Structures are given as C-alpha cells and as structure tokens.
Design a protein around this ligand. Structure first.
Ligand SMILES: [Zn+2]
Ligand SMILES: [Zn+2]
Length: 265
C-alpha cells in the first residue's frame, strides 16, 4: 500500500520529545505505509526555513505561499513568484481565506489569495486552499480568477456537500483530515460520501487534528493511515483501493511522475 499525507506542517512538529528529527517522522510514516508527504509553509520566511530543515528528500514535496491567517506583515509578491519556481515546490499556498479570527484583514487576505492563484496559473502549479467561515468569498475568487487554469485542492475540507459540489465543478480535489472522525463531524462524513473517489485526497494537517483513535495527541503524518482507513470505511472500499486512487489523484493534481509514487525497486 502507498499512502500520501497531502498536507502536513513538518516545521511544526515536536522534535523535542515526540520525534528525534525529520528522518524519524518519515520512518514512522513509512511503517504505516505513508510514504510521501507534501510539506506546507505558512509564510515566505518559514518556507526558507522549511527547505533547510527538511533538505533534499525523495519522498517530500513542498508548497510555497502565505497562509490566510498570516496577513498582517506585508510581503512581496515578487518573492512569492521567485520562490514558488524552486524545484521541490509543487503548489502555491496554503492560501485561501479564514474569517474565523476576522480582525478585518479580509481585504488583504483576498488580495493575497488572488496573487497565489495568478502565480499558480503562471507556473502551472496548483493552489492548496484553506477556507473557514468564508464560503461565498472563496468560490467567488476561485471562479473569477480562473483557478481552473492551474487546478487545486480544498485542503482539510470542513464545509458541506453542496459546497464540495461547487468546488468539484471547478475541477478541484477535496482532501479530508482527521476532523472527519470527530463526533460532531456528520456534515463532513456526508461530504466524504459524496466526493467521487477520483477527486479525493487525505491528509493530517499535522500537528493539528489528530484522528480517532488518537485524539488528544499531537498529529503526525503516519496518522494519515487512520484517516485513510476511516475514509475507506465510509466510502465502502478497501483501504488499499483508497490508498491507490488518492495517490493517483495526488500525482495528477501536483504533476508528480508516478514512479516517485511507487515502492518497486
Ligand atoms: Zn489550512
Ligand atoms: Zn495547513
């Protein structure tokens, strides 16, 4: 079985006591057949740090961008354009909109989200979209900025089936995290059933949202294995089938050679 954790904050894990270092994390992941990860940075300075921390690895790819919640300090789109063109970067983001802690940065959040899409369009790399309490503004921007030009994934999906449908209509992929195993998450379980297999992805969004049976513990990439089994159960398929379909979807969306996503040889 070959699983991909499509969204994890490798620079945010506990390397003090939980893990020895990145090697350790990835080996723990490989032990549960999680053999590839997409490492996510939240700002440009943190992206630079992430590349140095992680180094050059065969089973890790990166996003480059500025999170919706990190829009108080300005940044130069020109730096985003340059850094996103680096080898290793397969996506723009995570970008999107988050109005939960809305101190009125939505105008800056929008401007940034628009730039991330533009750069994705320019480099033919998709956008990783984070959205929260900002449904209408998110779809408005996705449709208006022609995200269909570069493609993308609604990462850590927490909306409803109707919303999933509008996103699917734009070619989008929908990734589910451990939140889908939460007691209060029926709405998500409902969306999980609806999303076609060929548009599904899974992730942990580590270190947050550890899934059952590990709630209360720091999340780690290996746990995408539980997310996957859970989704398989909900979708009515074997985890090996979900693992191969989601890994094939990952390869298509992020333009990754299938050979890098297999364990033969
Ligand atoms: Zn996010
Ligand atoms: Zn994230």
């Amino acid at each position: 079985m070959f699983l991909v954790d499509s969204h994890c904050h490798l620079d945010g894990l506990d390397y003090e006591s939980l893990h020895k270092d990145v090697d350790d994390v990835l080996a723990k992941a490989a032990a549960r057949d999680v053999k590839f990860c997409l490492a996510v940075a939240t700002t440009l300075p943190s992206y630079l740090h992430m590349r140095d921390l992680v180094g050059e690895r065969d089973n890790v790819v990166f996003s480059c961008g500025v999170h919706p919640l990190n829009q108080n300090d300005p940044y130069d789109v020109e730096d985003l354009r340059r850094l996103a063109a680096e080898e290793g970067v397969v996506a723009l983001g995570e970008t999107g909109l988050d109005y939960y802690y809305t101190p009125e940065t939505k105008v800056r959040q929008q401007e940034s989200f628009i730039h991330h899409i533009q750069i994705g369009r320019e480099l033919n790399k998709p956008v990783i979209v984070h959205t929260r309490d900002a449904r209408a503004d998110t779809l408005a921007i996705l449709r208006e900025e022609k995200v269909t030009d570069c493609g993308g994934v609604l990462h850590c999906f927490t909306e409803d089936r109707e919303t999933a449908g509008k996103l699917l209509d734009l070619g989008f992929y929908i990734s589910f995290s451990g939140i889908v195993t939460f007691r209060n998450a029926e709405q998500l379980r409902d969306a999980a059933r609806y999303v076609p297999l060929d548009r599904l992805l899974v992730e942990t969004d580590s270190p947050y949202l550890a899934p059952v049976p590990h709630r209360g513990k720091e999340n780690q990439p290996a746990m995408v294995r539980d997310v996957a089994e859970y989704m398989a159960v909900l979708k009515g398929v074997a985890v090996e089938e979900l693992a191969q379909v989601t890994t094939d979807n990952f390869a298509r969306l992020f333009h990754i050679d299938a050979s890098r996503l297999q364990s033969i040889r």
